[model samples]
Target: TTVQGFDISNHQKSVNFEAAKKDGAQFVMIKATEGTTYKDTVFNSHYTGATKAGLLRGGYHFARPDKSTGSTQAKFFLKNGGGWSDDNRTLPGMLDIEYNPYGATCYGLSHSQMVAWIHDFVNEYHHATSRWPMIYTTADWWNRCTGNAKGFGDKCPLVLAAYSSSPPKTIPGDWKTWTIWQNSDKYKHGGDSDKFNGPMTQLRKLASG
Candidate 1:
């Protein structure tokens, strides 16, 4: 099995990252920026703390593709969380696209349009960071939003989110393998958490670009 990991945001509070590491986490994905104009309240603190604790650290942006152009959001994500070096520690960023809490399910875009929007974001992110951002989504959402995100799944890596006692037997979109698996929202650690698809060294390569 792969190593245990966690995904966190400002919603969680006062993490003793060193203790969390001692609790057996091998990596962390922290929310850095959300949408085009907002930064997570605790991103800077969390990013620093997690790294200082020796956990492999990554940043992600919660995308609002319908509200802004993809490049705008991608640049915002990069400025805050997508910063990376040749050092094998920090992940550039992952694109977090799911149901829009206050808007249409797929942010009011047609299926093909949704794919186009994401393409803009993904292309900009890659152009800036030289690494393709991972896609975080579930089966129905991917199918509904991006028309199963056909070609996207092969180009971008994936993260699976299913609140269950076990990892998914099948994931959404075209990609057959998952780079990460989100296990639960209330199940473990101080935040929503999960695991990687491989060990630390391999994960380093993924982060290295």
Candidate 2:
């Protein structure tokens, strides 16, 4: 039931998409935007390359809750590269809502505020794309920041990060299981390696929807 995948930012440099595809990579999540002003420089190249190499691809937005409202960030993300299409090769965008690289771990938001911010972003994304974005986060962070918020599991799919040989035994928030598991930070052909927790058909369904 597992399918291999990878995720990347500009730091990965030029990736060999064909090699990654040949190495059993089924999909890729490329960094698209961070905050309102920063957009990934290599996002276009990575998207086109992954597309040419025959893999489903999606964009990921690095959340900046302190800088602006969640709805604003979501709009910026969609305009930059977080857009989704009806094509099976395009997956729903992802929201990277983990620790803030700047300073504050919760982006200076209160627990309830963090939950509201996430809800705003997800709602805006769903309004634009008609699909709830994939939420990438760690269990500890989710608990610490959002106070283990409820209700997200019924909407947004969870992309759990745990550099372990097996999937996480305890999921954060309300998700029963991870939709995607980030297994390691290294990939043979490019960036962090990931896995889909379901069959190829289900993955495609996720993409097309």
Candidate 3:
């Protein structure tokens, strides 16, 4: 029962870490980078705040279309420091893959093609860190995406976002299991009105490895 936490980015100028702590936030996940060119300002702020406050911390990269080679997108994440450090309590890293349109040059990749792209991204992260990365997506996005759990292999952890009071009975394939279940919308910190609730010890275990 990890009580609550906040997921923030540079979009909000700054976050009230102390308020979050007071409000029972036990962890924090910050947006480290997006695509290859953009960096989230609040990333450093949140990281520093979480560390100083002694809260569990994790980082995520927003997936972008592969305008060039598929690896290019992954390289952007890596270039912007996406991998986890030895001291990182979180198991590995996370790839935020909801609502991606495949866009322009890469726009019409079939379901399989999309899955392949996702695999490439995951593989690249694994190669660099030697750790399995988590996949974060909503139910609607998962239904529309090119692949399912099987396509990602059982080794990858699924961080499902249903936003429902009750858990989803069936997830795509044989996902290792749900690692993080974002089940709420009343966070203690700053955001565009998005909140999440999930199992605390389980999350911490997965994150801290």
Candidate 4:
């Protein structure tokens, strides 16, 4: 079977962290920040609560590269929720880069500009945490905005979102295999089904990085 997880935010406020664990949730990616000024109302609760529930914890940022510098957003994300270590209880951070509900799909950046934006954001995050942030995106969006940008190699892992019962057969752009697959936004493996690419030991090592 797959190691199931969930990505939660203030919107999923009704999510009972402990309940999800008992329901089979193995890990959690908590929505933490956006742009420079916005912070998720339940980030602290989610972070603390999930770990307290014995689930691996991670933090992700909603990138608004077109609105400000990637550095600015990265710092804001870390300051509020990105402080992490190889505690074996915390998973690596993630960058939730995808379409904006408020504006342009690529957030108004051209393909190359979007690539640079991601590098800047993830580079800053790597410098802060040592482990690079996992890139969270869909194949379509990656093709649409990133121009199939590659070069991340192993430095940045991919947390791909695809609605499938199983993990993707192939990952386009930079990654060969996804480190985590968000199977579906609406499905439940615990809640909002997700899969870790490997076993718990490997996951802990990844988190320790």
Candidate 5:
């Protein structure tokens, strides 16, 4: 199945959740927090609107500097309501660990360090929720950081974002069982013009699970 979602950072305001629903979007992953600090202002509004529209909703935290451990970031997400007991059926919370330019810093952790940090964050979430949080990353990061073909375990679902017309054929990891495959950028929803890709059935299964 396919899943569509957008990564809202500091740039987005008031997501058109109704529009997304009208356009057949079944799930939305809102950016709740980033690092050990910044919280997305639009997170609450989008979340509330999506929930009201009856769309399956999930939240993701953009990994901060590698120097900051994943556990620290997970705590930040939890403090901002990341556990999400009310919407257990929807997909579990996710960790977006792609694109870290901070490696240039002397304090920055190496690629391996960043992967370890991600493991820490995932472990922390499992500790609290007893559910394996999904991992979101580009193919490049997956190949570079986690050399193994199985990037995350078999139980941990994946949301792979590859902005390509053809399938992400070159992705190195073994992802035959991806739960969400983001395949395009030309999605149209409601009255809004911008578009995204998502898998509706997968989202429903996740939420209802």
Candidate 6:
């Protein structure tokens, strides 16, 4: 069994959370911050709307490795909306580290540098929230960028993005399996469609922690 979910950014515009629930989404990851500044303007509304719809929701941060240190970005993210508690409906903050939308794929960082950067971000988030943050990226990006970094799988859940007809086969980094698979970029209600690897109980467990 699996749980349905989705992710949203300002690009998604206004979302209909109840319709998303009716369409079978059990959770949502909303974009909260980018770089060391620029909190998503609609993050609060999207979060409240998702929560009101009874959907497990979490905020995500877009990594900007070139602009600042990982610690700075993590702190910025938490200060905005990425903070998480033991509340049942809140999932830990997610780090969105993918191909740089602006320029270099690895954000001009060497392999070892990238790995350490991620450690810094996750460590800071864990220190503040008492929970390891989730990581969102594709196998291609992770392997190429981090040189398939090890150790993170034991701490963070993987949100694998692969637009395919079936579940992803090639796992990245230290993760043997993906916790959430982003199977499609198109969601009728807005944003990308995602699927938790397990049932609602397991997804809820992640949030309630």
lDDT of each: 0.82, 0.94, 0.66, 0.83, 0.66, 0.93
Q: Is 1 or 6 the stronger prediction by TM-score?
A: 6
| CA lDDT, candidate 6, residue 50 | 96
Off by over 4 Å in 1: none
List, residue by residue over 4-30, the lDDT tens digit for candidate 5.
454444356666777777766666777
Candidate 2 lDDT over 4-91, as tens digits, reads: 9999999987999999988899999999999999999999999999999999999999999998998999999999999998987899
Question: For residues 1-209, what per-residue lDDT tens digits would candidate 3 score against the true structure?
Answer: 33565566776677777777777776666788777677776677777877788666677788775543445666676666466765744435678877755445324556677677778888888787776777777656666666453666476677777666677565755564466666654544775222333566565666655
Model 2 residue runs over 4 Å out of place are: none
Per-model TM-score versus the true fold:
0.95, 0.98, 0.81, 0.94, 0.82, 0.98
Model 5 clash count equals 11
Deviation (Å) of 89 in candidate 1: 1.5
lDDT (Cα, tens digit) per residue for candidate 6, span 94-151: 9999999997879999999999899899999999999999999999999999998889
Identify the runs in model 5 with alpha carbons over 4 angstroms from their true place.
1-7, 86-89, 101-107, 148-151, 172-174, 190-202
lDDT per residue (tens digit) for residues 1-209 in model 4: 45778898888765677878888787999889988899999888888888888999888898888889888889998898876886778887789998788877788899989998888998999889888888888888888998878987578888888897666876868687898898877845233567888887777777887
In the range 98-193, model 1's lDDT, one tens digit per residue, is: 889776678899988888888999999889878788888877788888878677766687988888887788777778788888888873567877
Deviation of model 5 at 103, angstroms: 6.7
The deviation in Å at residue 30 for candidate 2 is 0.3
Q: Ten residues in a row with the worst lDDT in model 2?
A: 165-174
| Ten contiguous residues with the weakest lDDT in model 1 | 83-92
Q: Number of the top candidate by lDDT? A: 2
